[PDB]
Amino acid sequence: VPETRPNHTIYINNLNEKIKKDELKKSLYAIFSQFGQILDILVSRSLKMRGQAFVIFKEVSSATNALRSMQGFPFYDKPMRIQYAKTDSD
């Protein structure tokens, strides 16, 4: 869990796989909006995207504070694991 190139997008895994993707997106917004303006939250029903999401902030500083504060937060009773996203085009 290091600084691996600050990014305005955070990658979340260890998510509760039983939750419907629309609900999960909204619930993510509920807890992450406190750190500043979110452009989008990406969740896929794709198979290799099971307990995963990307939260895209306008500012890199929102992402950094969100990663620092919410590391481990039990979300649907499951502690989330958060890193900076790694550059692909999305």
Short mmCIF file of N, CA and C in Angstrom, two decimals:
data_model
loop_
_atom_site.label_atom_id
_atom_site.label_comp_id
_atom_site.label_asym_id
_atom_site.label_seq_id
_atom_site.Cartn_x
_atom_site.Cartn_y
_atom_site.Cartn_z
N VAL A 1 0.85 -1.24 0.00
CA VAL A 1 0.00 0.00 0.00
C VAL A 1 0.87 1.27 0.00
N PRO A 2 1.59 1.52 -1.10
CA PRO A 2 2.42 2.73 -1.25
C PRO A 2 1.84 3.83 -2.19
N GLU A 3 2.51 4.98 -2.20
CA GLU A 3 2.31 5.99 -3.25
C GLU A 3 2.89 5.41 -4.55
N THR A 4 2.00 5.01 -5.46
CA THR A 4 2.42 4.44 -6.75
C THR A 4 1.88 5.33 -7.86
N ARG A 5 2.41 6.56 -7.89
CA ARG A 5 2.02 7.60 -8.85
C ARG A 5 0.58 8.05 -8.61
N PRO A 6 0.44 9.12 -7.83
CA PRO A 6 -0.84 9.77 -7.62
C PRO A 6 -1.60 10.00 -8.91
N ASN A 7 -2.90 9.78 -8.82
CA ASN A 7 -3.80 9.69 -9.95
C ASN A 7 -5.12 10.25 -9.48
N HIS A 8 -5.91 10.82 -10.37
CA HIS A 8 -7.23 11.29 -9.99
C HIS A 8 -8.30 10.19 -9.93
N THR A 9 -7.92 8.97 -10.30
CA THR A 9 -8.80 7.83 -10.26
C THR A 9 -8.31 6.83 -9.22
N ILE A 10 -9.20 6.41 -8.33
CA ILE A 10 -8.89 5.33 -7.42
C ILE A 10 -9.56 4.05 -7.86
N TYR A 11 -8.81 2.99 -7.66
CA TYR A 11 -9.22 1.65 -7.94
C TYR A 11 -9.55 0.97 -6.62
N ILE A 12 -10.75 0.40 -6.56
CA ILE A 12 -11.22 -0.28 -5.38
C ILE A 12 -11.46 -1.76 -5.65
N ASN A 13 -10.89 -2.62 -4.83
CA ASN A 13 -11.34 -4.00 -4.83
C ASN A 13 -11.67 -4.50 -3.41
N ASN A 14 -11.86 -5.81 -3.27
CA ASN A 14 -12.48 -6.41 -2.09
C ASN A 14 -13.91 -5.95 -1.86
N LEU A 15 -14.63 -5.67 -2.94
CA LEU A 15 -16.02 -5.24 -2.82
C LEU A 15 -16.97 -6.43 -2.68
N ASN A 16 -18.09 -6.17 -2.01
CA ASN A 16 -19.14 -7.16 -1.79
C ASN A 16 -19.80 -7.56 -3.12
N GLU A 17 -19.54 -8.80 -3.54
CA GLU A 17 -19.94 -9.27 -4.88
C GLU A 17 -21.45 -9.48 -4.99
N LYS A 18 -22.15 -9.57 -3.87
CA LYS A 18 -23.60 -9.82 -3.86
C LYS A 18 -24.47 -8.59 -4.12
N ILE A 19 -23.86 -7.43 -4.36
CA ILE A 19 -24.60 -6.18 -4.42
C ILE A 19 -24.84 -5.79 -5.87
N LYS A 20 -26.03 -5.29 -6.17
CA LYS A 20 -26.37 -4.94 -7.55
C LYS A 20 -25.61 -3.69 -7.98
N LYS A 21 -25.12 -3.71 -9.21
CA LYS A 21 -24.20 -2.68 -9.67
C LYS A 21 -24.74 -1.26 -9.61
N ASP A 22 -26.04 -1.06 -9.80
CA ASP A 22 -26.58 0.30 -9.71
C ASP A 22 -26.50 0.78 -8.28
N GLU A 23 -26.88 -0.09 -7.34
CA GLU A 23 -26.83 0.22 -5.91
C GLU A 23 -25.42 0.50 -5.43
N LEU A 24 -24.48 -0.26 -5.93
CA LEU A 24 -23.11 -0.16 -5.50
C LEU A 24 -22.50 1.17 -5.92
N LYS A 25 -22.78 1.57 -7.15
CA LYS A 25 -22.40 2.88 -7.67
C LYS A 25 -22.96 4.02 -6.82
N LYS A 26 -24.25 3.97 -6.48
CA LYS A 26 -24.86 5.03 -5.68
C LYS A 26 -24.28 5.07 -4.24
N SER A 27 -24.02 3.89 -3.67
CA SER A 27 -23.56 3.80 -2.31
C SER A 27 -22.11 4.29 -2.26
N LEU A 28 -21.33 3.97 -3.27
CA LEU A 28 -20.00 4.53 -3.41
C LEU A 28 -20.03 6.08 -3.42
N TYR A 29 -20.99 6.63 -4.13
CA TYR A 29 -21.14 8.07 -4.22
C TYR A 29 -21.42 8.66 -2.85
N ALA A 30 -22.32 8.02 -2.12
CA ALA A 30 -22.66 8.43 -0.77
C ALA A 30 -21.45 8.62 0.18
N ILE A 31 -20.44 7.78 0.09
CA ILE A 31 -19.30 7.83 1.02
C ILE A 31 -18.07 8.58 0.48
N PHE A 32 -17.96 8.68 -0.85
CA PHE A 32 -16.83 9.31 -1.52
C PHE A 32 -17.08 10.74 -1.96
N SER A 33 -18.33 11.17 -2.05
CA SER A 33 -18.60 12.53 -2.47
C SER A 33 -18.03 13.56 -1.52
N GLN A 34 -17.83 13.16 -0.26
CA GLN A 34 -17.25 14.07 0.76
C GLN A 34 -15.84 14.61 0.44
N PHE A 35 -15.13 14.01 -0.51
CA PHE A 35 -13.75 14.35 -0.78
C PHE A 35 -13.59 15.28 -1.95
N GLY A 36 -14.71 15.65 -2.57
CA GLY A 36 -14.75 16.55 -3.71
C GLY A 36 -15.52 15.97 -4.88
N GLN A 37 -15.44 16.68 -5.99
CA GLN A 37 -16.25 16.43 -7.17
C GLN A 37 -15.79 15.16 -7.87
N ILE A 38 -16.74 14.24 -8.06
CA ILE A 38 -16.56 12.98 -8.76
C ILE A 38 -17.08 13.15 -10.20
N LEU A 39 -16.25 12.84 -11.19
CA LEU A 39 -16.69 12.81 -12.58
C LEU A 39 -17.53 11.60 -12.92
N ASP A 40 -17.09 10.44 -12.43
CA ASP A 40 -17.78 9.18 -12.66
C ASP A 40 -17.33 8.07 -11.71
N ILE A 41 -18.18 7.06 -11.60
CA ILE A 41 -17.88 5.81 -10.92
C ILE A 41 -18.15 4.65 -11.89
N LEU A 42 -17.12 3.90 -12.23
CA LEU A 42 -17.24 2.76 -13.14
C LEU A 42 -17.36 1.44 -12.41
N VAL A 43 -18.47 0.76 -12.61
CA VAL A 43 -18.64 -0.62 -12.17
C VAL A 43 -19.07 -1.46 -13.38
N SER A 44 -18.46 -2.62 -13.58
CA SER A 44 -18.90 -3.49 -14.66
C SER A 44 -19.54 -4.79 -14.17
N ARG A 45 -20.56 -5.24 -14.90
CA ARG A 45 -21.15 -6.56 -14.71
C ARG A 45 -20.28 -7.65 -15.36
N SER A 46 -19.25 -7.24 -16.11
CA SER A 46 -18.24 -8.18 -16.65
C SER A 46 -17.67 -9.09 -15.55
N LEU A 47 -17.18 -10.26 -15.97
CA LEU A 47 -16.78 -11.31 -15.03
C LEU A 47 -15.49 -10.96 -14.31
N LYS A 48 -14.53 -10.41 -15.04
CA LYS A 48 -13.26 -10.09 -14.42
C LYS A 48 -13.31 -8.75 -13.66
N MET A 49 -14.52 -8.19 -13.48
CA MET A 49 -14.73 -6.96 -12.72
C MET A 49 -15.55 -7.18 -11.43
N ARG A 50 -15.47 -8.39 -10.88
CA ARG A 50 -16.37 -8.85 -9.82
C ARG A 50 -16.55 -7.89 -8.63
N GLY A 51 -15.56 -7.78 -7.77
CA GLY A 51 -15.68 -6.93 -6.59
C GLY A 51 -14.82 -5.72 -6.78
N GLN A 52 -15.02 -5.01 -7.88
CA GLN A 52 -14.13 -3.92 -8.28
C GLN A 52 -14.86 -2.68 -8.75
N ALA A 53 -14.21 -1.53 -8.59
CA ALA A 53 -14.75 -0.26 -9.08
C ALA A 53 -13.66 0.78 -9.25
N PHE A 54 -13.96 1.77 -10.08
CA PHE A 54 -13.11 2.91 -10.24
C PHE A 54 -13.90 4.13 -9.91
N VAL A 55 -13.31 5.00 -9.11
CA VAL A 55 -13.91 6.28 -8.79
C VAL A 55 -12.99 7.30 -9.39
N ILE A 56 -13.56 8.20 -10.18
CA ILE A 56 -12.78 9.18 -10.92
C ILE A 56 -13.12 10.51 -10.36
N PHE A 57 -12.13 11.14 -9.73
CA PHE A 57 -12.30 12.49 -9.21
C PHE A 57 -11.80 13.53 -10.21
N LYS A 58 -12.40 14.72 -10.18
CA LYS A 58 -11.85 15.88 -10.91
C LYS A 58 -10.39 16.21 -10.52
N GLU A 59 -10.09 16.27 -9.21
CA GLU A 59 -8.75 16.62 -8.70
C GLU A 59 -8.00 15.47 -8.08
N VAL A 60 -6.72 15.39 -8.38
CA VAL A 60 -5.86 14.38 -7.79
C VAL A 60 -5.85 14.45 -6.26
N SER A 61 -6.07 15.63 -5.68
CA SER A 61 -6.00 15.79 -4.24
C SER A 61 -7.23 15.17 -3.56
N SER A 62 -8.36 15.15 -4.25
CA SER A 62 -9.55 14.46 -3.76
C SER A 62 -9.30 12.96 -3.69
N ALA A 63 -8.69 12.42 -4.72
CA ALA A 63 -8.36 11.01 -4.76
C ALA A 63 -7.40 10.59 -3.65
N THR A 64 -6.39 11.40 -3.41
CA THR A 64 -5.40 11.14 -2.35
C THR A 64 -6.00 11.16 -0.94
N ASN A 65 -6.78 12.17 -0.64
CA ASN A 65 -7.52 12.19 0.61
C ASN A 65 -8.52 11.05 0.77
N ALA A 66 -9.13 10.63 -0.33
CA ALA A 66 -10.12 9.56 -0.29
C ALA A 66 -9.42 8.26 -0.02
N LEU A 67 -8.26 8.08 -0.64
CA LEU A 67 -7.48 6.86 -0.43
C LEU A 67 -6.94 6.79 1.01
N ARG A 68 -6.50 7.92 1.53
CA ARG A 68 -5.94 7.99 2.87
C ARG A 68 -7.00 7.76 3.95
N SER A 69 -8.15 8.39 3.80
CA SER A 69 -9.18 8.28 4.80
C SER A 69 -9.96 6.97 4.80
N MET A 70 -10.20 6.38 3.62
CA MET A 70 -11.15 5.30 3.46
C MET A 70 -10.51 3.93 3.31
N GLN A 71 -9.18 3.89 3.37
CA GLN A 71 -8.48 2.60 3.41
C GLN A 71 -9.05 1.75 4.54
N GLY A 72 -9.56 0.58 4.23
CA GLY A 72 -10.04 -0.35 5.23
C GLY A 72 -11.50 -0.18 5.62
N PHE A 73 -12.16 0.87 5.13
CA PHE A 73 -13.50 1.17 5.59
C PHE A 73 -14.43 -0.02 5.32
N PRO A 74 -15.13 -0.54 6.33
CA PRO A 74 -16.05 -1.68 6.10
C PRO A 74 -17.33 -1.24 5.39
N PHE A 75 -17.39 -1.55 4.10
CA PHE A 75 -18.43 -1.08 3.20
C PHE A 75 -19.26 -2.32 2.82
N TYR A 76 -20.55 -2.29 3.13
CA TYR A 76 -21.35 -3.52 3.15
C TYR A 76 -20.62 -4.59 3.95
N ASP A 77 -20.11 -4.17 5.11
CA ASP A 77 -19.38 -5.04 6.02
C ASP A 77 -18.16 -5.73 5.48
N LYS A 78 -17.50 -5.12 4.51
CA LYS A 78 -16.31 -5.70 3.90
C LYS A 78 -15.26 -4.58 3.72
N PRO A 79 -14.12 -4.70 4.38
CA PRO A 79 -13.15 -3.60 4.37
C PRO A 79 -12.60 -3.34 3.00
N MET A 80 -12.68 -2.12 2.48
CA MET A 80 -12.22 -1.94 1.12
C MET A 80 -10.72 -1.73 1.01
N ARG A 81 -10.19 -2.19 -0.11
CA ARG A 81 -8.78 -2.07 -0.42
C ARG A 81 -8.73 -1.09 -1.58
N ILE A 82 -8.03 0.02 -1.39
CA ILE A 82 -7.99 1.11 -2.35
C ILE A 82 -6.54 1.39 -2.78
N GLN A 83 -6.33 1.54 -4.09
CA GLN A 83 -5.09 2.07 -4.67
C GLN A 83 -5.38 3.12 -5.74
N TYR A 84 -4.37 3.89 -6.10
CA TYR A 84 -4.42 4.68 -7.32
C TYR A 84 -4.57 3.76 -8.53
N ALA A 85 -5.42 4.12 -9.48
CA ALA A 85 -5.52 3.39 -10.75
C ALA A 85 -4.21 3.42 -11.54
N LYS A 86 -3.99 2.38 -12.37
CA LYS A 86 -2.86 2.30 -13.32
C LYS A 86 -3.30 2.58 -14.77
N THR A 87 -2.68 3.58 -15.40
CA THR A 87 -3.01 4.06 -16.78
C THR A 87 -3.42 3.02 -17.88
N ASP A 88 -4.74 2.88 -18.06
CA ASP A 88 -5.38 2.44 -19.32
C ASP A 88 -6.32 3.59 -19.74
N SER A 89 -7.01 3.48 -20.88
CA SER A 89 -7.64 4.67 -21.49
C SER A 89 -8.95 5.17 -20.83
N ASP A 90 -9.48 4.41 -19.87
CA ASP A 90 -10.79 4.70 -19.27
C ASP A 90 -10.73 5.66 -18.09
#
